[PDB]
């Protein structure tokens, strides 16, 4: 029998639910969504990391002008300064006076090391959402099935035939352009590789930062060196990557709606408690705890003996009952702000079974069900 | 493997006005949050005339592969320092702060010693960077680099450095509401979001006993206390 | 009389490949706002083979327990320190914080130093926290040490120790009102109260030529103007 | 379970009470003051003898 229940995405908190099937009392169903991963397809746009500015020695042409030739360095910038150095002595040595001409060249590369202090710029196109759905059916055993939240791959697993109809909200860690550092993940726009931003993120761009043959813009401004030294001095705009890492006021990591650990796999939202998850659980008729077999539930009452106010499972209550035929009845609360710890209760002829519950109310009012029979539990803490 | 030959290089200050040194540091990586240093020297360490050794270096100074013992050419801060690994053209050493490294020969009246002021770099590895190793707390992942060579530059790695810890967010449970009395002894970044239906998008830098109250829906919340990656509590009285 | 003598010891922090050092320290008290520091050393001044002198030391310098006059065994913070008195087991020198006391050998081109860290708590306990002793101006609460021997340790004391200052406020009494024309060249904690019955509980740190008017009861007022303990003025009308 | 009661210093009647708690039958409480020592801190002003 295929039975469709909806578990609120409570990560780590098992959701008690009842499997109703005609003229058969409920089946113990506890569903815990262990993990939801929104994983989108990532096309890597570029690496950015702590750059190192590299100053090569400048080309001085004695007795004539120096022309700049473009070089494939990432923020290669040159400027030609004429008449920099007199003939001989200080500066360049030359026969000619102010015919000395300097090309002052410099560039940025990625540092010696970058693989732990780098961000990755990704264009992101549409993904898949996986859900690790732990479905227990019949009695406590905590079976679990990876199942696509998408229609692509329903779990045809032996741990019930599971279809996960799409989660009501499945958090999107992506927009179109996302930068991931994974210590601070940002939905963050940038121009596609080959075009960067100067002194803002994309300060260094690559697609595998290795030093040289990367593309950068960082607003490198060579300065003219006063005579008596031959070298290339420069000013530059601040590092955009370093500024970007510190732009944590609450990254994508902290704005996640129902809380998700936005993570660098390349960009995915881990451990979301987002939405509520449609769960189609095939509970076979063979796993029923039905009234029409050994269960029969009559005369049900809930007494709460003590409780800790709105606690993890600090509620202690006892459900006293009568059975015409002893069985095992599933203890449950269809709430998502309250769950019963156990999902089974030994229904007996005149028994009492003390069950532990959780509620989100100071005075815990949760609807407790054994089998097909329902009671309300209240206060008395 | 290493095979980039030893060389000499000008170092800003040696002797009095001496600057014609070998063994001179060109570049430094300080990716470590520990007091270890990755050094790029003109001179090649970890190679003598015999090829690859673990306690010999080579330099020019009128030579091209002439070697000495790593104790003859001794690293120092203002006291000796012993290197740990050689990766050719790069040295990696323990020198007390890892923020001042002086590689020098204090042999005879001509005293060439190069010093480069090295650095310790702290960068996110949790959701925040963290301070230098202390007595307090326990080791966590840090930015770092390899501390043994391949048989030329050492490669970045995440290794473990002692984090400054202090009391983590002392949670005080209340009716589906969590005030977090946090008591740093050191600059810690407090990041939150709820893991209930709500969210608590709050980065704040904290130091010393403070409170930061957050809402919850009875369905958990995350507090990251920077230097760690997310820590999560879920539907207690959360 | 001292019951212990110097010995070689593993240093808490010394240069790597020199940590097998001579000359070491046990404990230091620097809880004082005094410029002087009380040292319990194992590289002892105030101990020769004959015991307590005022200008002699003993050490095991990688040699044996023997003495010479102060020369090779130097106290330092990280810069020189001049001893004041030596008392056998305990040494007294000025090395102001007392959280870092460094016993080091300063001969030859090399710089050998063992440094010992200490478990000092130096906190406010005065009416203000202030600079260590110079020579100038009026004192403030400290917790100095005795500056002569009794041969075993130097005793703990609370007194008042020197502080810098600048010309004291130009007071003007007038009708129930007292203006303090101030000329700090140095940060002063200004605490006030009237001494009649008016509370005026007013702390402020001041620096630079400014004026601060205060109410008076007409029955005096205290203004403490930092780097002095309470100063009080009175009159029939103030 | 905390139950806060006040017992008369009477050994004639030792003060009997019941502790109620929901879903339970009460608890025996009988309280007897066996001994009382009123002890204050004393600062000696003077001897006379």
3-state secondary structure B41-69: EEEEEEEECCEEEEEEEECCCCCCCCEEE
Put simply, the answer to whether B230 touches A253 (Cβ < 8 Å) is yes
Q: Which residues of B touch C13 (CB under 8 A)?
A: 96
Asked if B80 and C110 come within 8 Å (Cβ–Cβ), the reply is yes
Measured CA to CA, the distance from residue B222 to residue C9 in angstroms comes to 48
- Which residues lie closer than 8 Å to A236 by C-beta, 6 or more apart? A53, A108, A199, A218, A219, A220, A221
Pick the residue of A52, A112, A261 with the most B CBs within 10 A to test the interface with B by mutation.
A112
Q: Is the dihedral of CA A237, A242, A244, A246 positive or negative?
A: negative
Is the CB of residue A58 less than 8 Å from the CB of residue A231? Answer: yes
Are the beta carbons of A308 and A64 closer than 8 angstroms?
Answer: no
In total, the C-beta contacts within 8 angstroms joining chain A to chain D are 12
The number of beta carbons lying within 10 Å of the beta carbon of residue B53 is 17
- List, in order, residues 6 or more apart from B67 with CB less than 8 Å away: B47, B48, B49, B56, B57, B58, B59
Q: Which two tokens stand for residue C91?
A: 């040494």
- Does the beta-carbon distance from B199 to A117 stay under 8 Å? no
For this entry, resolution in Å reads 14.1
- Smallest CA–CA distance, residue B151 to chain C, in Å, is 25
Task: Measure Cα distances from A186 to A236, A253, A267, B229, C52 in Å.
Answer: 25, 7, 10, 16, 69
Element (H, E) at A243: helix A240-245
Do B108 and B123 contact (CB within 8 A), yes or no? no
Six-digit token string for B194: 């709820």
CA atoms within 13 A on the CB side of C82: 1
Q: Which of B213, B218, B210 is nearest to B234 (CA)?
A: B218
State phi, psi for A285 to the nearest 5 degrees. Answer: -65, -25
What is the rounded CA–CA span in Å between residue A224 and residue C19? 50
Residue B201 φ/ψ, nearest 5 degrees? -60, 85
A9-29 b/e (C-beta count within 10 Å ≥ 16 → b):
bbbbbbbbbbbebeebbbbbb
Which subunits have 3 or more CB–CB pairs within 8 Å of chain B? A, C
- Cβ distance A360 to B220 less than 8 Å, yes or no, reads no
**Helix, strand, coil % over all residues of chain C, rounded to 5:** 0, 40, 60
Q: CB–CB of B201 and A255 under 8 A? A: yes
A10 touches chain B (CB under 8 A): yes
Residues 6 or more apart whose CB falls under 8 angstroms from that of D48 comprise: none
Does A113 touch chain B if contact means CB atoms closer than 8 Å? Answer: yes
Q: The tokens of C157 are what?
A: 């004391």
Q: What is the largest CA-CA distance in chain B?
A: 78
Judged by 3 or more CB pairs under 8 A, whether C touches A is no
Method: cryo-EM
Query: Which are the contacts of A303, defined by CB distance < 8 A and separation ≥ 6?
Result: A317, A318, A319, A320, A377, A380, D22, D23
Cβ(A228)–Cβ(A83) below 8 Å: no
Give partners of A (≥3 CB pairs < 8 A): B, D
- The DSSP call for residue C11 is -
Across the interface, whether the CB atoms of B123 and A117 are under 8 A apart is answered yes
Is B121 touching A (CB cutoff 8 A)? Answer: yes
Nearest CA in chain B to C18: B80
**Closest CA relative to residue A53, chosen from A183, A211, A162:** A211
Contact check, Cβ <8 Å, A259/B195: yes
Q: What is the nearest CA distance from C53 to chain B, expressed in angstroms? A: 30
A304/D22 touch (CB, cutoff 8 Å), yes or no? yes
d(C-alpha A148, C-alpha A126), whole Å: 15
In this complex, the residue of A273, A311, A337 whose CB is nearest that of residue B195 is A273
State the residue for tokens 């307090």.
Answer: B136
Residue D10 Cα distances to A127, A173, D22, angstroms: 80, 73, 31
Please tell me what DSSP assigns to residue A287: G
Residues of C at the B interface, defined by Cβ within 8 angstroms: 13-18, 109-113
The reply to whether B220 touches chain A by the CB within 8 Å rule is yes
Give the residue from D25, A366, A314 showing the smallest Cα distance to A378: A366
Closest-CA residue of chain D to A381: D22
Beta carbons within 8 Å of A22's beta carbon, 6+ residues apart = none
The first and second tokens of residue A261, run together, are 């650990």
Closest residue, chain B, to C13 (C-alpha): B96
Rg (alpha carbons) of chain D, rounded to whole number: 19
User: Which residue from C15, C16, C109 is facing B111, i.e. has the nearest CB?
Assistant: C109
Q: Write out chain B residues lying below 8 Å of A309, CB-based.
A: 175, 237
The residue assigned the tokens 């020297």 is B41
Residues of B within 8 A of A52 (CB-CB) are: 27
The CA–CA distances, whole Å, from B7 to A153, B19, B23, B107, B116 equal 61, 14, 8, 20, 17
Using a threshold of 3 CB pairs under 8 A, tell whether chains A and B touch: yes
Q: In chain B, count H helices and then E strands.
A: 0, 17
Q: Any residues with CB less than 8 A from the CB of A302 and at least 6 apart, and which?
A: A317, A318, A319, A368, A375, A376, A377, A378
- The 3-state DSSP class for residue A285 equals helix
């Amino acid at each position: 029998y295929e039975h469709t229940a909806v578990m609120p995405n409570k990560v780590g908190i098992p959701y008690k639910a009842l499997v109703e099937r005609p003229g058969y009392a409920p089946v113990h169903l506890q569903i815990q969504l262990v993990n939801t991963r929104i994983i989108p397809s990532t096309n890597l746009e570029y690496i950015t990391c702590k750059y190192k500015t590299k100053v090569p020695s400048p080309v001085v042409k004695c007795c004539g002008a120096t022309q700049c030739t473009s070089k494939p360095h990432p923020d290669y910038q040159c400027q030609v300064f004429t008449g920099v150095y007199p003939f001989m002595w200080g500066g360049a040595y030359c026969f000619c006076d102010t015919e000395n001409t300097q090309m002052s060249e410099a560039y940025v590369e990625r540092s010696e090391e970058c693989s732990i202090d780098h961000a990755k710029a990704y264009k992101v196109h549409t993904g898949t959402v996986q859900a690790m759905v732990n479905i227990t059916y019949g009695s406590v055993s905590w079976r679990s099935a990876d199942v696509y939240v998408n229609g692509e791959t329903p779990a045809k697993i032996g741990d019930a035939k599971l279809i996960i109809g799409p989660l009501s909200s499945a958090w999107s860690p992506f927009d179109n352009k996302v930068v991931v550092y994974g210590h601070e993940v940002y939905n963050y726009d940038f121009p596609e590789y080959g075009t960067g931003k100067a002194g803002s993120f994309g300060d260094l761009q690559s697609r595998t930062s290795t030093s040289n043959d990367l593309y950068a813009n960082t607003n490198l401004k060579l300065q003219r060196p006063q005579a008596g030294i031959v070298h290339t001095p420069f000013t530059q705009a601040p590092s955009g990557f370093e500024r970007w890492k510190r732009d944590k006021g609450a990254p994508l990591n902290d704005v996640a709606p129902f809380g998700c650990s936005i993570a660098l796999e390349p960009l995915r939202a881990e451990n979301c408690a987002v939405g509520s998850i449609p769960i189609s659980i095939d509970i076979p008729d063979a796993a029923f705890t039905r009234i029409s077999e050994t269960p029969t539930v009559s005369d049900l009452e809930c007494k709460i003996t003590e409780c800790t106010y709105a606690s993890d499972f600090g509620g202690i209550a006892t459900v006293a009952y009568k059975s015409s035929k002893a069985g095992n009845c599933p203890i449950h609360s269809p709430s998502g702000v309250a769950v019963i710890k156990e999902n089974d209760v030994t229904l007996a002829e005149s028994g009492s079974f003390t069950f532990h519950f959780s509620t989100a109310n100071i005075h815990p009012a949760f609807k407790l069900q054994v089998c097909t029979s329902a009671v309300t539990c209240k206060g008395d803490c | 493997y290493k095979l980039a030959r030893p060389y000499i290089a000008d170092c800003p200050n040696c002797g009095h006005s001496r600057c014609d040194s070998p063994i001179a540091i060109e570049e430094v990586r300080g990716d470590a949050h520990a007091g270890v240093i990755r050094i790029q020297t003109s001179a090649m360490f970890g190679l003598k005339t015999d090829g690859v050794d673990l306690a010999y270096m080579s330099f020019m100074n009128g030579k091209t592969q002439k070697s000495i013992k790593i104790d003859n050419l001794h690293v120092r801060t203002s006291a000796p320092c012993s290197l740990v690994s050689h990766h050719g053209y790069y040295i990696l050493a323990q020198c007390p702060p890892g923020d001042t490294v002086t590689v020098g020969f204090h042999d005879g009246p001509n005293r060439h010693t190069c010093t480069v002021a090295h650095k310790v770099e702290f960068r996110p590895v949790g959701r925040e960077k963290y301070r230098h190793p202390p007595e307090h707390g326990v080791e966590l992942p840090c930015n770092r680099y390899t501390h043994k060579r391949a048989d030329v530059p050492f490669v970045p790695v995440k290794a473990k450095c002692i984090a400054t810890l202090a009391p983590e967010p002392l949670v005080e449970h209340k009716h589906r509401t969590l005030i977090l009395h946090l008591h740093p002894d050191h600059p810690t970044l407090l990041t939150t979001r709820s893991l209930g239906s709500d969210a608590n998008p709050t980065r704040q830098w904290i130091e010393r006993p403070t409170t930061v109250n957050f809402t919850v829906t009875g369905e958990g919340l995350e507090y990251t206390w920077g230097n760690h990656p997310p820590k999560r509590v879920w539907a207690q009285e959360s």
